[PDB]
């Protein structure tokens, strides 16, 4: 029916079967680009705000603060605009320029800094702005806020289960906050009770999850895969439900996104390319040859025109 505001219109994204990846259509993709602010972050942008409202921590007159740098900022921005909250977002410069472009149009207070142009400086600045009548600023903290995986457990997961009629065997998802794969895996494994394979994807340039799990030296690095590879283990990543970790490189991720466009007619982002690459690698193993693989496509390629995608 009719939604009270845009934040209520989150989710219910479609599953599309791939024809040039996997083995006879065992790879299907969930296109999260079909969201109110056109990324997966719309869900947590809505639910974090809702939960902060229900906890009383978010009230009229209080300002929203977070670091994000990516799609979470856009989601929080549209939700704040829709539900009447002033919002300040912290980020140096500047990747990507469309990220930087939308936020100003959505009327968020962009505070621009530069440690070495980094999230260290951004988060520090966020903490500082919070430290100024802290009863006026509220930090939602997407990396540890339980509402983040909660919304994925309540919507995304059940949507996957519903649309696959409980046939989903594998879920492949890149990890940024970890919320997506955490919530989804919790929903399908615990609430529905099916023992699927949860597959986390990370850049091979910064495989901190693989390194941690293997008990090797954790060495984060630079990469071109927007949205994932935070370079640390976020609190919203539930390692306990992670069955498998796949690493993908920036070049292959990019090429895979381009392939989604040109061959599948799917306008997918870089991290979407990475997720699809990992999922394809799994799909062409006999072990998963006859299993249904569901792959999360977080964002849309139009948010990457300024990047190396084009």
């Amino acid at each position: 029916a009719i939604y009270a505001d845009n934040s209520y219109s989150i989710g219910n994204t479609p599953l599309v079967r791939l024809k040039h990846f996997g083995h006879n259509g065992n790879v299907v993709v969930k296109i999260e680009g079909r969201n109110p602010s056109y990324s997966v972050k719309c869900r947590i942008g809505a639910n974090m705000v809702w939960q902060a409202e229900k906890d009383g921590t978010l009230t009229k007159g209080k300002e929203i603060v977070d670091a994000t740098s990516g799609n979470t900022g856009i989601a929080l921005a549209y939700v704040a605009a829709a539900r009447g909250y002033k919002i300040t977002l912290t980020m140096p410069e500047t990747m990507s320029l469309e990220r930087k472009r939308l936020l100003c149009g959505l009327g968020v207070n962009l505070v621009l800094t530069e440690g070495a142009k980094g999230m260290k400086g951004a988060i520090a600045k966020a903490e500082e702005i919070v430290a100024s009548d802290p009863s006026r600023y509220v930090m939602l903290k997407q990396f540890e806020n339980p509402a983040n995986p909660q919304i994925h457990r309540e919507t995304t997961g059940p949507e996957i289960w519903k649309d696959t009629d409980g046939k989903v065997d594998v879920v492949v998802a890149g990890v940024g906050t970890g919320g997506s794969i955490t919530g989804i895996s919790r929903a399908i494994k615990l609430d529905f009770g099916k023992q699927i394979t949860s597959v986390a994807v990370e850049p091979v340039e910064s495989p901190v999850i693989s390194q941690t799990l293997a008990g090797e030296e954790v060495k984060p690095g630079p990469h071109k895969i927007q949205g994932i590879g935070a370079g640390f283990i976020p609190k919203n990543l539930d390692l306990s439900i992670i069955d498998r970790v796949e690493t993908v490189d920036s070049d292959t991720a990019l090429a895979t996104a381009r392939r989604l466009m040109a061959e599948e007619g799917i306008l997918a982002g870089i991290s979407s390319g990475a997720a699809v690459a990992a999922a394809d690698r799994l799909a062409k193993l006999p072990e998963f040859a006859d299993k249904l693989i569901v792959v999360i496509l977080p964002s849309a390629s139009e948010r990457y025109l300024s990047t190396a995608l084009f």
């Binding site: 999230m119 988060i123 910064s206």
Partner: peptide
């Protein structure tokens, strides 16, 4: 490029 929480 991206590292400690950038672009998320």
């Amino acid at each position: 490029t991206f590292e400690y929480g950038d672009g998320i």
